[PDB]
């Protein structure tokens, strides 16, 4: 495991220092449907014509990225995802840019997002939540060993694949940092108290966010909610959490140790690091090798309909991919 991590780091470092660039072109793909949107732009199902492989293609508008002050963060996202390789995230298969846009092409996860399944079902059993949680613990172990902080854990970002496993998606705030960092970013419900309080923070925010996720998966709502973000932040910084009565003892105990304001006590952050989590009692029934190797049966598999089936996603207005005759923001994105 120390050894697995060492080799993964050597592989990651080579790509990190010598990033792949301009590895496809838009005309090599057929666009089939928009799967999702946000401030970043759009994610589309596309088919690579040469192979007939389907992929998710994220399309960013350079001028919008500039207006949003996300140049460096977008550069981070692309440089990271082209360099990683892990079962529960989607590295870049291809990337490129044109006059107007930035493109990132990744493995397509057909099952939809956890968020939609979670809301519809209400909540997940502790076993069901533990299956997903384990995939997160392993991805964070991997990411943090590479000096990467993720900074946006939430159900909306966890895409379900055909086997019922998870892909962590949207690395718009991921950063390679060896010390502390200061950017106010993330999603209100999932922000650690250090972020809200404008302290310099580290990877421990990712472990706090796991606490929020496990809670939300098991309860059906988040530990800290309200109608407006400022109400949510007061609740986070006070820090008092109430657990549903259906929560097991072991679940509450882990959550007390993840949702811990005291950084000297927050699990994931201590001298034993990720093993405080992996060896906590709530995970006692978890075989971490079988999870990595995807040999455990998923508590929920979405129905096979086709490798390009989009029915586990919403419908969105389908707008064009307009490519200017003039190159926008050349210097800003020169390394992309």
């Amino acid at each position: 495991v120390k050894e697995f991590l060492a080799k993964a780091k050597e592989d990651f470092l080579k790509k990190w220092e010598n990033p792949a660039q301009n590895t496809a072109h838009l005309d090599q793909f057929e666009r089939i449907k928009t799967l999702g949107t946000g401030s970043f732009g759009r994610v589309m199902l596309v088919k690579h014509m040469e192979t007939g492989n389907h992929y998710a293609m994220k399309i960013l508008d350079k001028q919008k990225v500039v207006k949003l002050k996300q140049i460096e963060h977008t550069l981070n996202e692309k440089r990271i995802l082209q360099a990683v390789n892990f079962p529960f995230l989607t590295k870049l298969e291809f990337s490129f840019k044109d006059n107007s846009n930035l493109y990132m092409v990744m493995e397509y996860a057909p099952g939809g997002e956890m968020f939609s399944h979670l809301r519809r079902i209400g909540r997940f059993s502790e076993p069901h939540a533990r299956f997903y949680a384990a995939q997160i613990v392993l991805t964070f172990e991997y990411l943090h060993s590479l000096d990467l902080i993720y900074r946006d854990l939430k159900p909306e970002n966890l895409m379900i694949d055909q086997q019922g496993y998870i892909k962590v998606t949207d690395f718009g705030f991921a950063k390679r940092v060896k010390g502390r960092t200061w950017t106010l970013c993330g999603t209100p419900e999932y922000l650690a108290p250090e972020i809200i309080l404008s302290k310099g923070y580290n990877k421990a925010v990712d472990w706090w966010a796991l606490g929020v996720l496990i809670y939300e998966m098991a309860a059906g709502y988040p530990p800290f909610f309200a109608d407006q973000p400022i109400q949510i932040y007061e609740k986070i910084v006070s820090g008092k959490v109430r657990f549903p009565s259906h929560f097991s003892s072991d679940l509450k105990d882990l959550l007390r140790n993840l949702l811990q304001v005291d950084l000297t006590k927050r699990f994931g952050n201590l001298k034993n690091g990720v093993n405080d989590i992996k060896n906590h009692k709530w995970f006692a029934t978890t075989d971490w090798i079988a999870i990595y190797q995807r040999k455990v049966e998923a508590p929920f598999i979405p129905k096979f309909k086709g490798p390009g089936d989009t029915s586990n996603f919403d419908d969105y207005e389908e707008e064009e991919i307009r490519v200017s005759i003039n190159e926008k923001c050349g210097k800003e994105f020169s390394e992309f």
């Binding site: 946000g38 909306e156 999603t187 059906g220 309200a226 109608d227």
Partner: peptide, 20 residues
């Protein structure tokens, strides 16, 4: 119930990342 308070709240749909 807490469940009823959540479902009646304005934040049961997909939540966006923050902007400053």
């Amino acid at each position: 119930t807490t469940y009823a308070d959540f479902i009646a709240s304005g934040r049961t749909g997909r939540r966006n990342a923050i902007h400053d």
